[model samples]
Structure formats: structure tokens, C-alpha cells
Target: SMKNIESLFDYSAGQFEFIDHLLTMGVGVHFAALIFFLVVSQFVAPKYRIATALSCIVMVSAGLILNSQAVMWTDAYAYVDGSYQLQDLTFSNGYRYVNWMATIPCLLLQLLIVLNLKGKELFSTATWLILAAWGMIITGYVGQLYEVDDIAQLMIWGAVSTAFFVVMNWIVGTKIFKNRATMLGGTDSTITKVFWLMMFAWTLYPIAYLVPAFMNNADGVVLRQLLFTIADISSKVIYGLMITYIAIQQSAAAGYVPAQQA
Candidate 1:
């Protein structure tokens, strides 16, 4: 029921209004998820709680980014049916692009922690994930940031980004999934679910980069924003929820009591 409440207002055609609501939703969902991340962390075992903390970290980071963007949008669009003109100040999805660089590694670090991975294996997998994450995220930050495109130029960077993306996916499939078999509990299947969902959410991101390669119009901005918002929510917010879900399962399996087992 919470995805979109767009009808909650009578927004006009400017997309100033449409984007306004998307940024608002980003803030709302992310901030609220932070509260839940904090609350849910208590139910998990001490060791697994850091995963929840990383979940909260991204939510807090993104919430502020979106809240500021909402303010940015509000600042830029303070208008009265002001014809359908775009603004002088950019809505700047670049911060979100930049935002992804820091956050994805945090997300994967949490993933490893929750997987009970530590010591040499932890270092090994983490460095690779971070390396590939930087390559994938930063390369596309260049391209996606290039709504300034030369679509031909942006597309090349995207293909490069996709190259790292493929290697990243390979490592997760080959390396991390092997670690799953070594996990102590009966949680292997759920761990697979987490990886699948996280990567699936990530898969949507590079696809969004293709948007500017094809379409260049005002409504197209709205469409790109919509895709980013949807994927942002999927990757960060719902991914936070999914991470917490894994922590809860891992905590229980480790015999840390939450319900009456206390």
C-alpha cells in the first residue's frame, strides 16, 4: 500500500510536481526504515547487529540526500502553475549517483557480516566486492551523470561499467556463494535469497543508465527519476528490510532468543 500516494495531492503537469513527490517519498521511506532498522537490531544477536547498523547507515545517508533533494526541488520549483518550464538549478540526481558509490560497499559489507563471514575469507571477499563495486558504481556515475551526453560517449562508459558489473556478479556467484555452504545454520537458502534480491535490485540500476541513451525530453527526466526512485527504494530500503530479515533468521538460528526463548 505504501509505494505511491501520488493522488494524495493535485500536482500539476510541470513534473516539478511529479518529481517533488518522488523525492518526498524517498525521504519518507528511507527515514522510516532507519527507525525500523534500529528497532529490529535489538531482536538480533549481538554479532549480527552490525548488519542492521549498516542498513541504518545507508537509510540515514539516503534519507538526508533525498530530504535535501526534496528541499532542492522545493527551492527550485516554488511556482504557481508557472507554465511547464524546467528550472535553472538542476534537480541533480548526481548526488544520488555519487551516493551509490559509498552506500553499495556498506550494503555488501553488511551482507558479508550477516553471512557469518570473517577473518581472511572476509578480507578476501570484501576487497574484491569493494573493488568491483567502485568500478561499477564510479564508471556509471560518469555516464549517468552525463545526462550531459553525447549519448554515444555515455553508452561506452556504461558498457565499461557493465564489464565490472559482470565480474562483480561472477565473484558473488562463485566466491560468496561458496561461503554460504560453510555457514553453520540451516539458513543457506535464505542467504541465496538475499544475494538474489540485492543483485536483482542492482541490475535495475545500470538499465536506468540506458534511459538517457534513448530518450531526451522533459517527460523523460520524469521517467528516469521514476526508475531511479523505484530502484533506489528497492536496493536500499527494501534491501535494508531484507538484510534485517537475514539477521533475524541468523540470530535465531544461533540460539539468541527473541520471543519466549529469552
Candidate 2:
């Protein structure tokens, strides 16, 4: 028990089945991405391999975390009286916050590194970005402590979580836009696609965070996990693939040919 699962209503058969499948799908998605990231690293030149390597790190971490979450999903409830009810081993999604706490810094670093930030620039930007990232996630975890019971506290902590989120996004935006204008001269390219794709993916986490505010029911519980599943696909899996695309493109531009093409 990850500190009592808090108050939960029994779920209909359909709802129970939904989370089961979703968690299973999440497990498959992350681990598959891990394999893809690891293998694709060989295709990118060594200079760009740091970003690809971080993606692999992301996949493996998320895959291991999600695997545990899926097991927790099953152990957390049981079908009794024709509905899924809480079990002695309650379920908690606090693990996700833990996962994010670990991998999100890697995620931001991957983006910053691929933007061609050198030693000092990369170090400085990453320090602030990682701090803000940690701030957002830690605040969000605090907010979740109230998610089940105290609406007012939940709102307050959730708002503070976004304070860090806005700060982090601003830092990321500045890096991306300035570089786009100077380095790439404002031409639309794969890097811009990476930034926007990241924006799309990152926003989903906060939305899921706020779900308990309005949809605090069995449906909400299912929906939050649903949104998280969707976000994980985009953020971890697809985002890694997109960064790999940039690495491959950059490697080609640097006159380093992939083995297959060579």
C-alpha cells in the first residue's frame, strides 16, 4: 500500500476492464519505445548520441515504472459483488510522480542538448530547467495528496505546480525561438516540429492533474489514467522517436552516413 488509496467507489465492470487494458497498453508502449531508442542509437552519429541515449534512458525508466503501476492496478482492486472494489492492497498513482521526478530532467536535457547548446549554455539552461521541472512535479505530487479528500488544498497545490510549469516552458521557449531565428533562420524544420510536439505532449500532464477537480468520480479515475496513457505515448514514445529523427538528420548533414546507407 502506497499510503492508503484514499476514498474510492466501486467501479462497474466496464470501467475496471478499461484501466486494466490501458495499463497493459502503457507497459507495452514504453518498453517497445525503449527497444527502439536503444537500437536506433547506433544509426545516429556519436555527436548526436547523447539525445538518443537520453531517450533510451527515458523509455527504460518509464517502462519499469509503468510495469509496476500495471501490477498495482490489478492488485489494488477485486471484483466483489459484481463490481470492482478496493482491496487490502490499495492503489496509488504516486509512482507516476516519482517516475516523472526521475525522467523529466532527462527529457528536458534531451531537448536542450539537441538544440546544440554547448558546455556552458547547456549546463546553465539545464540547471534552471531541471530545477523548475522538479519544482512542478514536486508541487504536483503535493497537490495529489489532497486530490482525494481536500478540494481547496488540491487547487492551491495544483496552481503552484503550474507556476513551475509556466517557468519551465518559458525557459524552453526562449531557447527554441532564439535558436530557430539565429541558428536555423526561422525556416520551419524538424526541430520546430520537435518543440511543438513536446508542447502538445507536456500539456496533457497538467490537464490530467486537474481532472480530479471536476471529474472526481469513478469515471474521472478512469479518465485520468486514460489521459496519462495518451500523454505517455506522445511524450515518451513519440517524442523520443522525433528527437531520433533530428539526430539522424543532423548526423547526415555532418557527412556521417548511416551504416545501412553507406
Candidate 3:
């Protein structure tokens, strides 16, 4: 006989169903956002179209990855207390980390390109920013593994990631922001807004990562996931749209007009 497992009178199906629905909805929105960006890119100025288009492509991939693992990988199960309760176990499927690794670099690249950074500065910024992003993802991924029970280990990895983030922030503050007028050309204000938007959106990831550390429960898992989903939409879709907007505006200023008339 299979090892006898205790059966609860009230099985917790609703919890799983709700989270699954949330992920499904996210997947749908992401694909919609992707198509919307792609279609609009045709009308964007030639110089800016590629960066805008690339952001959408990367986001589509992130969305698909989230959908594929949404319910299947989440470790939610029923537990016996006075009554049957659902415990949302923390499971770090590598898919989310992979999604971050791919998307974060792309996001940074989009910003760098929008700034019209050239030669060595462009290559250097892109390389280090991507490296920092990878450091954040890989450390968090390792920390989240079920076997890594030490909270301090997780905290240390988070600190390292944050250190890298500080470096990127310093570069942005000194290089990108200071030179916005000259580097970003006519869409200076728009670029500044998008830069701040990326910063604010990117900030949410740390909060999401800290949730489980503070509260290890079903609520924490749901909160973290929800925050992350919102951040993804903000960073990828919202930020990308803004990038498209600036591209169009700057391109127009530069006299490269998009063909709208028949």
C-alpha cells in the first residue's frame, strides 16, 4: 500500500484555483501588451523602433515562462490544524530567475540605447548592468532553493545583489542623468521620466524578495507574486510604451517622420 497520508475533510481547492487564475490573467495581459507594442512600433520613428520592439519581444518571453510554470510549480497543499488549512509552500522554480535574467538586461539596454550612449560608454554600461542584474537573479534563485534554510545566507546574497544595484544606480545618477540633455537629445524630459519609471518599478523586486523573509505563509507568497507581476508590467510594458513615445517624439524632432498618410 502507498504510505497512508492523512486526508482532510475539506480539501483546499480554492487557493490553488485563485493563484492559477491570477497567473493566467497576467499571461494574457503580457501577450496583449506585446502585440500592442509591436503594432505601434511600426509608427514609431526609425531610430527608436528597434529598442521599443526588443522590449516587447523580451516581455512576451517572460509572460510565456510565467504562464507555463504558474500552477504546476507552486507548492500549495492542505495541512491539518484544528481544521484543514492551506499552506502555500515556497518553491523557487528557475523559470522566474531565467525570466529576470533575460528581461532585466533588455530593460537596461533599452534605457542605454534611448540615451544614445555611444562606443565604450554604451558597451560598458550595458555589460555591467547586465552583470549586476544576473548577480541579483542568480543569488536570489540560489537563496530561494528549498534546501537553503539559512536566512542569513539569503540575506548575504541579497546584500551582494544590492551592492551591485548601488553601482548601477551610481552610474545612472552620474552618467545618464547628468548628461540627459546632450546624451538623450530632444526627448530629454521624456527620457528622464522613463529613467525614473524604470527605477521605481525596479525597486519593487527587492520588496517582493523580502516578503517571504518577513512572512513565510500563503499570504506572503501571494503578495510577493502579485507585487512581482505588477512590477513586470510596469517595468516592461509601461516602461517600453514610454520608450516608444520618446522615440517617436525625438525622431520627429530629428526630421525622420513616420509614414501615416496614404
Best by lDDT: 2
Q: Name the TM-score of candidate 2.
A: 0.93
lDDT of each: 0.74, 0.80, 0.68
The 10-residue segment of model 3 with minimum total lDDT is 1-10
**What TM-score do all the candidates reach, one by one?**
0.88, 0.93, 0.83
Pairs with steric clashes in candidate 3:
none
Residue range 34-126, candidate 2, lDDT tens digits: 788888788877877999889888888888887787787788788998998888555787888988987999888888866778889989999
lDDT score, candidate 3: 0.68
- The residue ranges of model 3 lying beyond 4 angstroms of the native Cα positions read 1-14, 71-91, 146-148, 183-186, 259-262
Whichever of 1 and 2 has more lDDT, that candidate is 2
Cand. 1 Cα-lDDT: 0.74
Error of 2 at 249 (Å): 0.1
Which 10-residue window in model 1 sums to the lowest lDDT? 1-10
Root-mean-square deviation (CA) per prediction? 5.4, 2.3, 5.2
For candidate 3, give the lDDT of residue 20. Answer: 65
Name the lDDT value of residue 202 in candidate 1: 83
Count backbone clashes in candidate 1: 0
Q: lDDT, candidate 3, residue 243?
A: 76
